[PDB]
Design a protein around this ligand. Sequence first.
Ligand SMILES: N=C(N)N1CCC[C@@H](CNC(=O)[C@@H](Cc2ccccc2)NS(=O)(=O)c2ccc3ccccc3c2)C1
Ligand SMILES: *[C@@H]1O[C@H](CO)[C@@H](O)[C@H](O)[C@H]1NC(C)=O
Lengths: 257, 11, 30
Amino acid sequence: IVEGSDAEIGMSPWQVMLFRKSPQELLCGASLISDRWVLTAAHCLLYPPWDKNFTENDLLVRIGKHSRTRYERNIEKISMLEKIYIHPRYNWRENLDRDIALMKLKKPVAFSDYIHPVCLPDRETAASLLQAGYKGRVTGWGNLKETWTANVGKGQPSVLQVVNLPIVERPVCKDSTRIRITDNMFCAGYKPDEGKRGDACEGDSGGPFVMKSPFNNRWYQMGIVSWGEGCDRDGKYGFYTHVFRLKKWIQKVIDQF
Amino acid sequence: DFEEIPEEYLQ
Amino acid sequence: GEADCGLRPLFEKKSLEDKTERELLESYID
Ligand SMILES: N=C(N)N1CCC[C@@H](CNC(=O)[C@@H](Cc2ccccc2)NS(=O)(=O)c2ccc3ccccc3c2)C1
Ligand SMILES: *[C@@H]1O[C@H](CO)[C@@H](O)[C@H](O)[C@H]1NC(C)=O
């Protein structure tokens, strides 16, 4: 997260860390949607142009975390994966279309003050909340700047970061990039003339873009951090997987499995 | 720079 | 019924609000 700030403890209890076993490194964000299912971006796990193809045994999922690096003995739960499911029509060749994946935990996690699932939206929520100019929230442990001076600058955050960003009109999204955008994506960020900044960055991918409904007080996952071009560039916007448009696939996978 | 986690998970 | 979701034990459930959520809600009414 570029130009965000420190999360409060428990502010995002559905935030999941994808953790590589060997070498030990932060892979990506994810989110908790029930006691045994985790939602993330497909490109976190599978991207053949860079020979990236992670397996159930390559990864741990860490839930309830605040610190990026500490083993938070009293608070976090570490789980292994039973099975990974990638959208069958996930398009890694040209635009990261349908950038979505589900992961089933080997055992259920116990909820607590620090571990709690986010809601997926229904039709009415999606139609009310997904409108240009409205703001959602992005969280993660990814980089604080696109680039920095080696061994001097920082870098990676020490605790979870948070930034609030407005949804941007579809035509402005389209004009900002040569990449072919589909209806399975939306874009968010400030416009160059607005004098605020903020973006997701490396390591934030797969994490949740969430919105709060004023009428029932619940948080909904509307997007997944998918892609962009650098971090926090002027006249550039982050792109997000459209969770609602892909809800039917989620429903199939959870029901069948 | 990660603190180590129980090696049961990493073996 | 439907499993509880999107209500945080340390915030909504204790009627506390986080430092910046007010910014999100205000965006709905401009
Ligand atoms: N700026 C935001 N919000 N971002 C999301 C989080 C990571 C940030 C840094 N990453 C990035 O800036 C890009 C760099 C990149 C750009 C084009 C192609 C390959 C890599 N990685 S990416 O994961 O966003 C990515 C990966 C594969 C792709 C394939 C086709 C088209 C676009 C693709 C974008 C960008
Ligand atoms: C990735 O690896 C898995 C299991 O190791 C294999 O079954 C699958 O075909 C691979 N997919 C690609 C696109 O390389």
